[PDB]
Amino acid sequence: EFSEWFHNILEEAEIIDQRYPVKGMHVWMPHGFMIRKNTLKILRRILDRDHEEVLFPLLVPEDELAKEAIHVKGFEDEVYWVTHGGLSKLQRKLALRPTSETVMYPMFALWVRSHTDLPMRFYQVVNTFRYETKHTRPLIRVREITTFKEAHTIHATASEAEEQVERAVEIYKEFFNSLGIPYLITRRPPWDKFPGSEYTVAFDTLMPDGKTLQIGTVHNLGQTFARTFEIKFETPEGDHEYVHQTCYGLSDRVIASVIAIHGDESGLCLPPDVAAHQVVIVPIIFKKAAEEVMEACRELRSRLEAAGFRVHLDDRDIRAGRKYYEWEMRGVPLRVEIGPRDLEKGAAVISRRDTGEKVTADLQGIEETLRELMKDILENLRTRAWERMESEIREAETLEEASRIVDEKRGIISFMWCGEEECGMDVEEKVRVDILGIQEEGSGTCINCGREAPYRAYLARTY
Amino acid sequence: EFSEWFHNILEEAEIIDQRYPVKGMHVWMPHGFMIRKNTLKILRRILDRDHEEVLFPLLVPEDELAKEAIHVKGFEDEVYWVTHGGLSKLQRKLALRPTSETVMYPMFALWVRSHTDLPMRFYQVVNTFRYETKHTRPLIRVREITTFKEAHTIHATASEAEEQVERAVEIYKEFFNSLGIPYLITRRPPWDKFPGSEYTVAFDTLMPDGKTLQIGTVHNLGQTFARTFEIKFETPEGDHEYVHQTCYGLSDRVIASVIAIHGDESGLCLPPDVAAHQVVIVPIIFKKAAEEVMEACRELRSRLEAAGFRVHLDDRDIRAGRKYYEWEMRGVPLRVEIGPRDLEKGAAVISRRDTGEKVTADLQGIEETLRELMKDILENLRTRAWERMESEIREAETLEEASRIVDEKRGIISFMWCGEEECGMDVEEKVRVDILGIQEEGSGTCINCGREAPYRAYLARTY
Numbered sequence: 001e002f003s004e005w006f007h008n009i010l011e012e013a014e015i016i017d018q019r020y021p022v023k024g025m026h027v028w029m030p031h032g033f034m035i036r037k038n039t040l041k042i043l044r045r046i047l048d049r050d051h052e053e054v055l056f057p058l059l060v061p062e063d064e065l066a067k068e069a070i071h072v073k074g075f076e077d078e079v080y081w082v083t084h085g086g087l088s089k090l091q092r093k094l095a096l097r098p099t100s101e102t103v104m105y106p107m108f109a110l111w112v113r114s115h116t117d118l119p120m121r122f123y124q125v126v127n128t129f130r131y132e133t134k135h136t137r138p139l140i141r142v143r144e145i146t147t148f149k150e151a152h153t154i155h156a157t158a159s160e161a162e163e164q165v166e167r168a169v170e171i172y173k174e175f176f177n178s179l180g181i182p183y184l185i186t187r188r189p190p191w192d193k194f195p196g197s198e199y200t201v202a203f204d205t206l207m208p209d210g211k212t213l214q215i216g217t218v219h220n221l222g223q224t225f226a227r228t229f230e231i232k233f234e235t236p237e238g239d240h241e242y243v244h245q246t247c248y249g250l251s252d253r254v255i256a257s258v259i260a261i262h263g264d265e266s267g268l269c270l271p272p273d274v275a276a277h278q279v280v281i282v283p284i285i286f287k288k289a290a291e292e293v294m295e296a297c298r299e300l301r302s303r304l305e306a307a308g309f310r311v312h313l314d315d316r317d318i319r320a321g322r323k324y325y326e327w328e329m330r331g332v333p334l335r336v337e338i339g340p341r342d343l344e345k346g347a348a349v350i351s352r353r354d355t356g357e358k359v360t361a362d363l364q365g366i367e368e369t370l371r372e373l374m375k376d377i378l379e380n381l382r383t384r385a386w387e388r389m390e391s392e393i394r395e396a397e398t399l400e401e402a403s404r405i406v407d408e409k410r411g412i413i414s415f416m417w418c419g420e421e422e423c424g425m426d427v428e429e430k431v432r433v434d435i436l437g438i439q440e441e442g443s444g445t446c447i448n449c450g451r452e453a454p455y456r457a458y459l460a461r462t463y
Numbered sequence: 464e465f466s467e468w469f470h471n472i473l474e475e476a477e478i479i480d481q482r483y484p485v486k487g488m489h490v491w492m493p494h495g496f497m498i499r500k501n502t503l504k505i506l507r508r509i510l511d512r513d514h515e516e517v518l519f520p521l522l523v524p525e526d527e528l529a530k531e532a533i534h535v536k537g538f539e540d541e542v543y544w545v546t547h548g549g550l551s552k553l554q555r556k557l558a559l560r561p562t563s564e565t566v567m568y569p570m571f572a573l574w575v576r577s578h579t580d581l582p583m584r585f586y587q588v589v590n591t592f593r594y595e596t597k598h599t600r601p602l603i604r605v606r607e608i609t610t611f612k613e614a615h616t617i618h619a620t621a622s623e624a625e626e627q628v629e630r631a632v633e634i635y636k637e638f639f640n641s642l643g644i645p646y647l648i649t650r651r652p653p654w655d656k657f658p659g660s661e662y663t664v665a666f667d668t669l670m671p672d673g674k675t676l677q678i679g680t681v682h683n684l685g686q687t688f689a690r691t692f693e694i695k696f697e698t699p700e701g702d703h704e705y706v707h708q709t710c711y712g713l714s715d716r717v718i719a720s721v722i723a724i725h726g727d728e729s730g731l732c733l734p735p736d737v738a739a740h741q742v743v744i745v746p747i748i749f750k751k752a753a754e755e756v757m758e759a760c761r762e763l764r765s766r767l768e769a770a771g772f773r774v775h776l777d778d779r780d781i782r783a784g785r786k787y788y789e790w791e792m793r794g795v796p797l798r799v800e801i802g803p804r805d806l807e808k809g810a811a812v813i814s815r816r817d818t819g820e821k822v823t824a825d826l827q828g829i830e831e832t833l834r835e836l837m838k839d840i841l842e843n844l845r846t847r848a849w850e851r852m853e854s855e856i857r858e859a860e861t862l863e864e865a866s867r868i869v870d871e872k873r874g875i876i877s878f879m880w881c882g883e884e885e886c887g888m889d890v891e892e893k894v895r896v897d898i899l900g901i902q903e904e905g906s907g908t909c910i911n912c913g914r915e916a917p918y919r920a921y922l923a924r925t926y
């Protein structure tokens with residue numbers, strides 16, 4: 001049910017066109033692009049406080065890419081390879097970046113010398129490629145991840161690296177909260193962690209189809225990559241130790257989530273700061289003081305723009321009904337309607353997209369009325385969202401109880417787990433599900449082997 | 464001389480790092496990235512008035528790419544090819560886009576149906592690839608063009624297409640004027656035009672080494688591509704005719720130009736709206752009312768930010784001299800110095816980067832003082848630039864006179880030309896130079912074959 005909804009809204013709202021001759025690679029149409037644009041503004045506003053945006057190459061030579069032990073193994077048959085340059089065969093294969101560690105790190109080896117240099121915090125929003133699962137899914141599982149934001153940090157002590165991991169987590173919380181997206185933060189099992197990292201922390205959110213979606217990861221690379229690429233730095237004493245690194249990233253999935261989570265029967269419903277337009281002015285006219293209604297709207301649009309609004313006056317010549325539908329299925333938060341009546345009173349009608357509540361305000365201070373309304377809509381959408389999610393995280397004491405809940409209600413399954421490889425795999429297999437990760441807390445007994453359970457774990461059917 | 468200057472400023476100002484294991488592919492460091500960022504804001508501000516930004520895939524399948532007659536021939540051995548997906552060999556080669564016609568057009572075939580649909584004006588800023596000349600050059604001739612803005616338009620009548628070509632030209636003029644970049648607009652010879660187009664209009668600018676640099680092209684594709692990809696549309700009568708297309712684009716070269724053209728002995732000198740910072744506040748302190756000098760600067764920074772300035776307070780603990788040098792070689796337009804004296808008078812010192820003029824203004828209305836100063840700097844830089852260029856465009860009546868001027872003074876050579884293939888080639892060969900293009904005007908006699916010369920032509924040593 002959700003799948004069809006998603007696929008249809010992506011087309012109707014003209015977010016992306018999937019009809020491209022190469023599977024797993026979609027086109028961002030105008031509207032979709034605007035949403036992607038605003039989602040990124042929000043993200044960069046946060047990241048730019050303490051991170052420096054950069055832009056590295058797309059292609060990586062075998063030599064560099066394979067310098068990894070586990071990392072190369074982690075993307076082996078997952079990389080695309082350019083082998084020829086025209087008709088000529090390159091004397092050194094070039095791989096399309098799947099992620100940029102093997103691209104930036106050898107360069108970091110150069111950029112880093114003195115402890116005065118550290119800490120360095122970089123990031124970029126580029127396109128990465130991954131040859132995977134025959135199962136392609138829009139904005140969720142693509143071959144060309146068009147909105148891959150990857151951050152990489154460098155530190156002097158392993159201490160600061162961990163502190164960074166915590167900072168990243170706070171950055172994503174803030175990012176997501178702005179999108180009104182709820183999430184569950186856990187620590188991935190050591191066999192799911194980023195290839196070569198010390199550990200991986202992941203953010204997972206729940207899709208309307210009861211399935212979970214990883215929408216962000218933070219990895220603590222310790223000094224593994226440092227040693228691999230020789231990234232050393234001089235201490236104030238005169239020694240040469242390897243740096244401590246961490247990296248984290250999001251993808252188009254964030255945009256899928258926003259669409260999906262605040263999804264709706266009417267179409268898209270988006271946080272005001274993500275929508276292509278925050279306020280769409282629709283003048284109501286039947287050839288009765290039209291010249292006056294119009295100039296009332298125009299004046300309003302201009303007035304809103306100067307106040308910093310992303311407004312749009314829909315003066316097309318069609319039935320206001322059709323207009324309402326359009327901007328509604330597209331996700332515009334506020335609709336401002338103006339007609340002879342209201343006009344001849346100094347007021348207008350403001351309709352909400354999340355609720356439906358049409359209220360009446362004075363065109364005199366409307367700017368503030370709108371600003372407030374917007375703050376309200378986010379909080380509501382964010383709240384609703386959190387409720388909906390938490391109400392799907394259910395505890396289980398028996399592996400049997402789990403299988404029953406998952407299969408009947410889907411969602412997330414909370415449970416105490418011993419945290420052992422074999423036990424975990426066994427849990428996954430028996431329940432045909434994936435262990436999202438753990439959360440250290442009070443002990444108990446592993447839902448499976450009954451032994452001592454140091455961790456609170458979650459599992460679910462994932463994307 | 465210029466070359467070394469360029470290469471050194473790119474490194475000293477930390478614009479791009481060229482030390483990447485793959486030739487023709489550079490890294491944008493923080494500072495460089497900020498300039499690229501602002502240059503693009505300026506560009507998008509213009510383009511977004513009537514164009515819709517989008518984002519198509521990177522990879523193109525042989526099938527589509529080769530659908531062209533001359534176009535495929537035009538990029539034959541110029542394309543990179545991904546042949547394997549992991550260890551598996553794809554059953555259909557994928558080419559990294561060199562430009563996106565073969566990517567967007569088949570999609571346009573779908574997006575276009577009714578004349579009500581046209582006109583459509585799209586554009587994107589993506590990374591394109593081109594396997595060319597062994598001679599790699601930063602921001603000028605790269606294998607991975609990291610800042611390729613390509614616009615594509617669709618029209619109902621060939622009439623509107625031409626009108627579009629004129630619009631594009633006006634858009635680039637405005638874009639360039641904002642960067643204070645001078646240019647010569649001409650019509651490329653029919654053997655240099657974009658592969659498959661009706662004709663190509665190009666913008667060329669002059670580099671400090673007397674060589675010319677193509678910094679923009681607008682192509683009128685007529686219905687050539689329409690027929691190739693079956694892009695038809697329904698007329699109000701009910702007929703089905705092919706659409707009229709045009710496309711135009713710029714690259715990182717625009718950023719090279721800005722750096723190079725307003726180049727300088729002190730380092731970078733950039734248009735206020737391109738610099739990483741428009742105003743850098745440097746407090747002068749020697750342990751004498753410091754606490755008061757500082758709070759005077761801070762207050763100023765905040766005050767400037769709220770006014771919309773990209774300001775930066777350099778409160779580092781170093782000699783103000785070293786600070787001046789840094790922000791000066793980096794291109795910051797205005798430096799605001801504050802010390803005990805000036806402070807205890809309600810005024811500060813404002814130094815210009817283009818001139819050097821340090822003036823004294825009242826911290827009371829300084830915002831407007833600065834805004835004005837900025838407008839002044841652009842106009843100056845733009846003017847200087849135009850003078851410098853026009854003073855290098857020299858007329859020649861004899862093929863011999865040309866060879867003498869080119870070889871001794873470089874620059875552009877104006878001349879009357881018959882406009883014939885063989886005659887043109889002959890001119891180029893004999894003078895070891897390239898014919899930039901023509902400009903229809905009063906007749907005369909071809910500098911070479913003496914026959915009737917319908918066009919005013921230019922030639923020079925190019926990049």
Ligand SMILES: C[C@H](N)C(=O)NS(=O)(=O)OC[C@H]1O[C@@H](n2cnc3c(N)ncnc32)[C@H](O)[C@@H]1O
Binds near residue numbers: 215
């Ligand atoms: C930051 C680290 N270098 C990185 O690459 N981590 S990652 O491999 O976990 O990817 C980061 C995020 O990208 C998203 N992602 C991964 N593969 C994807 C795919 N094929 N399609 C869409 N999003 C994907 C997920 O939300 C994931 O959390």
Ligand SMILES: C[C@H](N)C(=O)NS(=O)(=O)OC[C@H]1O[C@@H](n2cnc3c(N)ncnc32)[C@H](O)[C@@H]1O
Binds near residue numbers: 608657682712715
């Ligand atoms: C718009 C059309 N589809 C296009 O591709 N035209 S073009 O091939 O002429 O390229 C547009 C512009 O990109 C720049 N350009 C072309 N090849 C380049 C290269 N190898 N490195 C840097 N800039 C390049 C030039 O300034 C040129 O005017």
Ligand SMILES: [Mg+2]
Binds near residue numbers: 192428434435
């Ligand atoms: Mg698992």
Ligand SMILES: [Mg+2]
Binds near residue numbers: 655891897898
């Ligand atoms: Mg030529």
Ligand SMILES: [Zn+2]
Binds near residue numbers: 419447450
């Ligand atoms: Zn167990």
Ligand SMILES: [Zn+2]
Binds near residue numbers: 881882883886912
């Ligand atoms: Zn001639």
